[PDB]
Amino acid sequence: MIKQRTLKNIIRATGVGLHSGEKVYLTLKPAPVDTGIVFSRTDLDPVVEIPARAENVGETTMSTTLVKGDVKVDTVEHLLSAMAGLGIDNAYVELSASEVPIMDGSAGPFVFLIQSAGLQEQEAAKKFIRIKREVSVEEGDKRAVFVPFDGFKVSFEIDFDHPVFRGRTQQASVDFSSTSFVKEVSRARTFGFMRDIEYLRSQNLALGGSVENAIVVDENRVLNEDGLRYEDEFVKHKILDAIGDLYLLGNSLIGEFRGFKSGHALNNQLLRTLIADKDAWEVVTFEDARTAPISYMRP
Ligand SMILES: COC(=O)c1ccc(O)cc1
Numbered sequence: 001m002i003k004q005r006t007l008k009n010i011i012r013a014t015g016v017g018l019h020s021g022e023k024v025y026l027t028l029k030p031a032p033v034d035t036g037i038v039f040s041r042t043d044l045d046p047v048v049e050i051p052a053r054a055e056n057v058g059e060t061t062m063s064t065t066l067v068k069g070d071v072k073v074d075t076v077e078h079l080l081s082a083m084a085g086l087g088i089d090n091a092y093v094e095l096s097a098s099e100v101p102i103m104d105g106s107a108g109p110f111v112f113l114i115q116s117a118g119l120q121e122q123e124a125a126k127k128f129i130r131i132k133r134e135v136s137v138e139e140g141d142k143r144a145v146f147v148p149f150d151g152f153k154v155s156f157e158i159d160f161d162h163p164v165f166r167g168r169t170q171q172a173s174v175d176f177s178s179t180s181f182v183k184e185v186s187r188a189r190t191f192g193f194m195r196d197i198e199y200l201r202s203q204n205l206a207l208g209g210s211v212e213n214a215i216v217v218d219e220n221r222v223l224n225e226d227g228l229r230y231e232d233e234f235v236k237h238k239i240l241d242a243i244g245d246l247y248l249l250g251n252s253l254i255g256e257f258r259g260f261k262s263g264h265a266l267n268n269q270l271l272r273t274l275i276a277d278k279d280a281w282e283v284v285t286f287e288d289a290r291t292a293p294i295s296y297m298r299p
Pocket residue numbers: 190191192193194197206209210211213214216
């Protein structure tokens with residue numbers, strides 16, 4: 001069978017929140033079968049756990065925020081993207097503060113830290129959500145859709161009228177049967193506009209933002225001296241965000257996601273609409289990895 005996976009070993013990292021600018025200690029720990037991804041605020045007494053599930057998304061302003069009452073875990077999407085990309089089902093994510101560290105603004109440092117620790121196959125079938133029928137949500141010119149697909153595929157389109165986007169790839173499709181999450185998507189970074197930073201800081205957004213953890217765009221050029229990792233880095237980052245947002249379903253998808261200018265808010269609304277529309281999906285297992293429509297790297 002395709003087995004559930006957890007971490008082989010505890011691993012530790014230090015960084016700062018993108019939004020809060022606060023220093024944070026991150027610990028990834030192994031978790032038993034059917035735990036899912038559970039975030040833990042270890043700075044609080046008593047400690048507060050928040051499962052990484054669509055129903056715990058409380059705020060979606062410029063990141064996905066998990067919330068239990070007054071307790072928040074902000075910017076979970078880049079770490080959940082890495083976990084979805086490596087096939088991690090079960091893990092405890094301990095944090096010393098209210099926001100996952102931004103690291104280099106991508107999933108690259110997370111995929112490296114996890115593959116460094118190693119993955120552990122567990123003695124239980126991995127459960128997938130197979131999309132059986134179209135489910136779509138719209139708001140204004142934004143759209144997010146699931147359609148049936150025998151595999152996992154993401155298509156995304158952004159539309160920015162900014163000189164730095166003129167004639168640039170604003171649309172991409174990744175089929176994870178053809179393409180490596182790791183080589184193709186994980187290194188795409190968070191991006192931001194100089195003309196926005198005053199408004200954002202006034203909203204307690206991007207307080208930790210800099211060229212060290214983001215592509216900073218200024219009028220006609222990228223400020224980062226060493227430039228882009230990909231010609232289409234911006235749309236690749238939105239695909240990274242979508243994978244992270246969609247992993248709040250709590251299981252890997254067998255289907256296709258298409259986003260048109262979709263962000264954290266509409267991605268979460270798509271998950272809530274799917275969960276409610278029970279005839280559009282089923283839980284499936286594969287008793288032979290070799291005959292299944294998606295494969296994961298050796299652990
Ligand atoms: C100047 O703007 C920034 O530094 C910045 C960093 C990260 C963002 O997400 C947005 C803006």
